[PDB]
Amino acid sequence: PFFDVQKRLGLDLDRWMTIQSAEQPHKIPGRCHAFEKEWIECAHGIGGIRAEKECKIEFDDFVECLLRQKTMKRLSAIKRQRDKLIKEGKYTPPPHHLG
Amino acid sequence: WKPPPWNDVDPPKDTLVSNLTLNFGPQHPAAHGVLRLVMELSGEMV
Amino acid sequence: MMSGRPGRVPLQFLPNEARSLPPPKLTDPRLVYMGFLGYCSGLIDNAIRRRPVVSAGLHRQLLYVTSFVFFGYYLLKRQDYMYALRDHDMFAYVKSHPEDFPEKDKKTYGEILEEFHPVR
Amino acid sequence: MNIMLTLLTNVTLASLLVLIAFWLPQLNAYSEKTSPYECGFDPMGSARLPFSMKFFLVAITFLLFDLEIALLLPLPWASQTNNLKTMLTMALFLLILLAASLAYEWTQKGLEWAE
Amino acid sequence: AGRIASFLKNAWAKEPVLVASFAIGGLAIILPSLSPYTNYAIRINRATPYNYPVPLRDDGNMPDVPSHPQDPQGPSLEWLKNL
Amino acid sequence: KTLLHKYSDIPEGTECHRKAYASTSIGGATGLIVSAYSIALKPPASFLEGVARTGRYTFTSAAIGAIFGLTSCISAQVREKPDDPLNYFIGGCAGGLTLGARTRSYGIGAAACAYMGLTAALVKMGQLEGWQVFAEPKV
Amino acid sequence: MTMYIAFILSTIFVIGFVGFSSKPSPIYGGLGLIVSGGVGCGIVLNFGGSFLGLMVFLIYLGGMLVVFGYTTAMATEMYPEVWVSNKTVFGAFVSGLMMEFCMVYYALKEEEVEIIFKFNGLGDWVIYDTGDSGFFSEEAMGIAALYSYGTWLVIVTGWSLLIGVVVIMEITRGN
Amino acid sequence: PGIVELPTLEDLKVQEVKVSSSVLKAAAHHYGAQCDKPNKEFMLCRWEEKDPRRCLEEGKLVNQCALDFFRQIKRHCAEPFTEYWTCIDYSGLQLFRHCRKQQAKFDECVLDKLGWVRPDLGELSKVTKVKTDRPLPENPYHSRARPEPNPEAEGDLKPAKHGSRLFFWTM
Amino acid sequence: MPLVYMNIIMAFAIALAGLLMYRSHLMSSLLCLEGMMLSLFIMSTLIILNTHFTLANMMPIILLVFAACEAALGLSLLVMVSNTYGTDYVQNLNLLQC
Amino acid sequence: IMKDVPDWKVGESVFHTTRWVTPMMGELYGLRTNEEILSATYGFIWYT
Amino acid sequence: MNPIIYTTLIMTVMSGTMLVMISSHWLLIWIGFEMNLLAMIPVLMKNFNPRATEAATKYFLTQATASMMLMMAIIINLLYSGQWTITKMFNPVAMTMMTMALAMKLGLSPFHFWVPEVTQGISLQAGLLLLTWQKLAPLSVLCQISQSINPNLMLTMAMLSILIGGWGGLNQTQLRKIMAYSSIAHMGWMTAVLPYNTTMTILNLLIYITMTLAMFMLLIHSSATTTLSLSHTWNKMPVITSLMMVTLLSMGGLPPLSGFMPKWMIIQEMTKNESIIMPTLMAMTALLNLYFYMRLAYSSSLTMFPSTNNMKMKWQFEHTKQMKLLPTMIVLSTLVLPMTPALSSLN
């Protein structure tokens, strides 16, 4: 905040929602509670400048958890491979993938 | 150009009134067949 | 800089450790100028309301100077405190980080060679 | 699956109804038959000129009213909380405020028609 | 006193609707506090388990929590069964 | 942002065909920019004359864009001192005269070599020294 | 096919979004928005936000309803516009429908894309997660927390509507 | 960025309880009271280790106990359970309300034959303690080393040397 | 990023193009004003359902409640645009050019 | 699938962290029968 | 606007603004703006003239659009980061997407268009509220996000604001339009130093606020909106136009007046960051500001101007109005240079 009163008078107005790893109704965890738990206690009171370099290899692991960016890239590459030999007809899926 | 009105009130625009003209008849069931009522009304009040 | 200083308490005019600093003197020239500033507000107020600019509303002038002096005195306490705080982590960082701050063995002018520019 | 199947079936049946309605009955159009109806005589000529209705103020307030009916809709699930003391206070706030907004809307004319 | 009662009577005559709304609306705010079941209502909400009562490891010195979901020790809710 | 990055990498004067080709691009590119607002704030009347406003503005910006490259080109090789801002002194403001010629006014083009001749020079010791018009917040 | 049904529902959201953003006659734009709003309900309904879909549906019908009343009240012309009649809106119309056509082709054809962000077209079905909700719906239970966790949000929102009726009367007072 | 470890096919082989929804729900109360020790240790390991791949064996143990509970329910009180689960099954929500009569017969049957007690309402939902001998997961989240804190603040506040030191202001 | 987030983001893009690039009707402009709320509402609802952000599930309606407030006061600006100028087309209001 | 690929290490954790994550359903039902994945994702949400 | 409700008319503007400084959640920062926006419109039409309704509406579309862009910049950041806390944005376009919006909230870039336009129709009192208070909220957000703003973005938009803002001032004769372009140029002054140090932008904001406060105080007291009507005021009240000059000198920033310190401190800090060409350029361009200050002063007190005879009727009566605090702001915004070290209190 610019003029921090939430800390001063000691009453929470918006901190409860600011993150997805905070306490949720009936303990419904977020999708990436494990990552946001680790990321938050990684760069806490260490410094915003002293955060983007050291709490990095843990941060993108979280940013991947939200968006599955390179994970979906993996599926696209695999599915792209399927199209390029199924038409060529070298391989057939095992019955596990049919029934 | 023209300086703005020094009292800061623009000259009132010319009337743009567009009251409806309606003929309540001579076919309306409440017109009782032969009543040609041309009424000037704005919205729903005559 | 220092809104991110550890232990910093927002919405607190003067923190506790500020009191360890020498309080500004009453006859501090910057403080008395702030009082002189309060005086100047007195003349203008009489001037805007077209009253006797030197003898009217002496009660108004008395309030117009005391209020400036008070807010002045507290402001200078904060003024000294921040400069002292800036000088504090100043010398904390120099001692905790010797390597990045070289103390060159500076040597007198008899050993240096500064070119002389013949002016004419 | 079922929901859009239900939706598709309904629009299809309606389309056929208007289709046989609009095509079958052996039309005969002669211009004055298609002329606008004006209670027996000719139209004065407009019907797209701005029909200045007088409930404009009550119109926008209804929008504001609906914005807060959406707010007070989660009450059936809100009652199944562990903090009814807080939930009851905040719930009654909305209705008190909604009445208060109407009360100002009422007392300062407002609801009354424009003549 | 007389003015206040007359104003109520003048209201009840001129308008019966808002006075009825104001009355029953006024009650809806007050008796929730005076009700002796409101502390029971939160208990009922707390009793209903939506998530699993995840078990916790034993290390001794824990008499309160039971070791079996039939043991006498633990939070019991026979109050709600009769209620 | 690559268009002026592809101008800096080309040395001044030498490879003039590439250097001028860049100098033509950045010049005329700004023309569509200024004309875009010129059409925007100052309302045109028709599509035919609307592109005409873009016509002159793109004509000029391309022209001064082109001539700055080639006039600074010739000085860079014949004088063999590209790292000397006279190359862009006569290289830059000569376009301003043509800019005055493009608006038919040698009068304003007379005042052009006073200013374009200057600002074109100031970019050179900017290149040579560590001058930065947009300095990163180092402190 | 219904496998990319969300791919479809996303599109007609924007064709309707384009149609009313081409600035046709005000009530025609009202139709152009509601089709997008109606299909827009479908996209979020598909993802699980049943309550969110119904509320964006419900109040925007109410929102668009009051818009229509004002349009014919003091915002309509004696010669109403159509999406085809005026060439300006016609140009706006045709530009919108080829803008999506050329792009969704490009996104679907390459499935990698670069514009603004990087987009793996693949399938929106992919990012759904193997999760169980138990005997409670997250999309509805989280909103129910507004009255137990968001007291500040309730106060600020509720207050704002109150001036919302104040301003709606303040500026309409007509002297 | 590393390997993925998953126990091979032979490891996750076990016969599963092949009974349907209504059967499980009808016997759920007595199943919870009887086979809780395998349940409690399995899900405690699930929450502690936070990885099924390190808890598959406990998954084997719970299925076997679920087998034995269902095996003995077939051996002794076969018929009363059959009426119970089919009558629960008819309802569209498996509501226990429309099965009190059949439940009474099932409850007494297991009360005398297999010697069981119907768990009281709320009794089964009690949180419980499990005396598992599994070691504590030291790093359940596989957290790495954390960045060291910033250089802390110490010393006492002394007057700023030469005051403000800004431009010509001597104090 | 999937195509659903894509096509919604692109939707707000031409909503801007509709909004500021104007026409001869203020109503149709404010139509696009509440229209671009659709994209942001639908966009926002997609993430917090996707991320299982239970708390932030009230942020759409809170956003959407304030949404029509702009429209609400927007319509009231229109009426006395009409009350004093009769019509709605945005060229007669230029007396403040001076 | 990834035998003839020039560079694709089999079984590579997309995340740097070695802790197991909740597996992403997209790769769970990735190459299964199109009907199966369709029921897997939009089953409940369409069930009626 | 009914007096009692006119108070809460302004109360939610202040609290709606106050929500921006005190909140730590992006939606709340978003919420604080329309509460400011929705309640700012009616006071702009408190007089309710066709010019006022003209002035209010151009504010609305400009401000509502800016808040609309503000919303996605939150969302893209949320989509790419998943946090609502007011920190650096984690996605570059969202950053530039916000900075584009907050400028339209602020009138920095060519967006500056709406600023002089709305000031004319809205009254002097409404303008007093607009150019002063309606700038605090966007500045607070920019100061918080100052970590990850593109330096070449903020500097460019700041440079233009002082460029057009100073240059557009050399055409106007209505004091309100002149004043808005002066505010537009000062808008650029604070925002140039925004990436380097945020203490200075507060310092220049404060000096700008008190000076613009005291400035409008004089304008209401003189009850003039055209140079000729102001030119008359030498007769009725020479003190008002005499101080009109002195604060006009603080406009230009001419020392030893207060107005120099904002320009002085910013140039010092920027030079510490090795930007010397940029501060030098705005230093020259600030002369354009000073030029129409001088002409405004010239028609005010240096040279007497033709008055009327019915104005000697005015000599009999006086201002029954006051509003307190004009005497304080003239002093605070003219003689404060000997107190530069007090800027460290903001730090």
Curated annotation (Swiss-Prot), chain D:
Membrane topology: Multi-pass membrane protein
Sequence similarity: Belongs to the complex I subunit 3 family.
GO molecular function: NADH dehydrogenase (ubiquinone) activity
Keywords: Electron transport, Membrane, Mitochondrion, Mitochondrion inner membrane, NAD, Respiratory chain, Translocase, Transmembrane, Transmembrane helix, Transport, Ubiquinone
Domain of life: Eukaryota
Main location: mitochondrion
Subunit field text: Core subunit of respiratory chain NADH dehydrogenase (Complex I) which is composed of 45 different subunits. Interacts with TMEM186. Interacts with TMEM242.
Gene3D superfamilies with a match to the protein in the record: NADH:ubiquinone/plastoquinone oxidoreductase, chain 3
Organism for this UniProt entry: Sus scrofa (Pig)
Name of encoding gene: MT-ND3
Function: Core subunit of the mitochondrial membrane respiratory chain NADH dehydrogenase (Complex I) which catalyzes electron transfer from NADH through the respiratory chain, using ubiquinone as an electron acceptor. Essential for the catalytic activity of complex I.
Gene Ontology biological process terms, A to Z: mitochondrial electron transport, NADH to ubiquinone
Protein name, per record: NADH-ubiquinone oxidoreductase chain 3
InterPro entries, sorted: NADH_UbQ/plastoQ_OxRdtase_su3 (IPR000440), NDAH_ubi_oxred_su3_sf (IPR038430)
Gene Ontology annotations for the cellular component aspect, listed alphabetically: mitochondrial inner membrane; respiratory chain complex I
Residues passing through the membrane, by range: 3-23, 55-75, 86-106
Catalyses which reaction(s): a ubiquinone + NADH + 5 H(+)(in) = a ubiquinol + NAD(+) + 4 H(+)(out)
The protein's Enzyme Commission number: 7.1.1.2
Compartment annotation: Mitochondrion inner membrane
Swiss-Prot record, chain G:
One Gene Ontology CC term in the entry: respiratory chain complex I
Keywords in alphabetical order: Electron transport, Membrane, Mitochondrion, Mitochondrion inner membrane, NAD, Respiratory chain, Translocase, Transmembrane, Transmembrane helix, Transport, Ubiquinone
Reactions the enzyme catalyzes: a ubiquinone + NADH + 5 H(+)(in) = a ubiquinol + NAD(+) + 4 H(+)(out)
Localisation: Mitochondrion inner membrane
Residue intervals passing through the bilayer: 1-21, 25-45, 47-67, 88-108, 149-169
E.C. designation(s): 7.1.1.2
GO molecular function, one term: NADH dehydrogenase (ubiquinone) activity
GO process annotations (BP): mitochondrial electron transport, NADH to ubiquinone; mitochondrial respiratory chain complex I assembly
Membrane topology summary: Multi-pass membrane protein
Quaternary structure (record): Core subunit of respiratory chain NADH dehydrogenase (Complex I) which is composed of 45 different subunits.
Annotated function: Core subunit of the mitochondrial membrane respiratory chain NADH dehydrogenase (Complex I) which catalyzes electron transfer from NADH through the respiratory chain, using ubiquinone as an electron acceptor. Essential for the catalytic activity and assembly of complex I.
Entry similarity comment: Belongs to the complex I subunit 6 family.
The protein's name: NADH-ubiquinone oxidoreductase chain 6
UniProtKB/Swiss-Prot annotation, chain I:
EC code: 7.1.1.2
GO cellular component: mitochondrial inner membrane; respiratory chain complex I
Membrane topology classification: Multi-pass membrane protein
InterPro entries in the record: NADH_UbQ_OxRdtase_chain4L/K (IPR001133), NUOK/Mnh_C1-like (IPR039428)
Gene Ontology MF terms: NADH dehydrogenase (ubiquinone) activity
The family this protein is said to belong to: Belongs to the complex I subunit 4L family.
Quaternary structure and interacting proteins, as annotated: Core subunit of respiratory chain NADH dehydrogenase (Complex I) which is composed of 45 different subunits.
Protein name (Swiss-Prot/TrEMBL): NADH-ubiquinone oxidoreductase chain 4L
Organism: Sus scrofa (Pig)
Gene name linked to the record: MT-ND4L
From Swiss-Prot, chain K:
Gene behind this protein: MT-ND2
Origin species: Sus scrofa
Protein name: NADH-ubiquinone oxidoreductase chain 2
InterPro entries: Complex_I_Subunit_2, NADH_DH_su2_C, NADH_UbQ_OxRdtase_chain2, ND/Mrp_TM
Molecular-function annotations in GO: NADH dehydrogenase (ubiquinone) activity
Assigned keywords, A-Z: Electron transport, Membrane, Mitochondrion, Mitochondrion inner membrane, NAD, Respiratory chain, Translocase, Transmembrane, Transmembrane helix, Transport, Ubiquinone
E.C. numbers: 7.1.1.2
Function: Core subunit of the mitochondrial membrane respiratory chain NADH dehydrogenase (Complex I) which catalyzes electron transfer from NADH through the respiratory chain, using ubiquinone as an electron acceptor. Essential for the catalytic activity and assembly of complex I.
Membrane-spanning segments: 3-23, 25-45, 59-79, 89-109, 149-169, 178-198, 200-220, 237-257, 274-294, 325-345
Pfam name, any one: Proton_antipo_M
Highest taxon above the source species: Eukaryota
GO biological processes: mitochondrial electron transport, NADH to ubiquinone; mitochondrial respiratory chain complex I assembly; reactive oxygen species metabolic process
Main location: mitochondrion
Reactions performed catalytically: a ubiquinone + NADH + 5 H(+)(in) = a ubiquinol + NAD(+) + 4 H(+)(out)
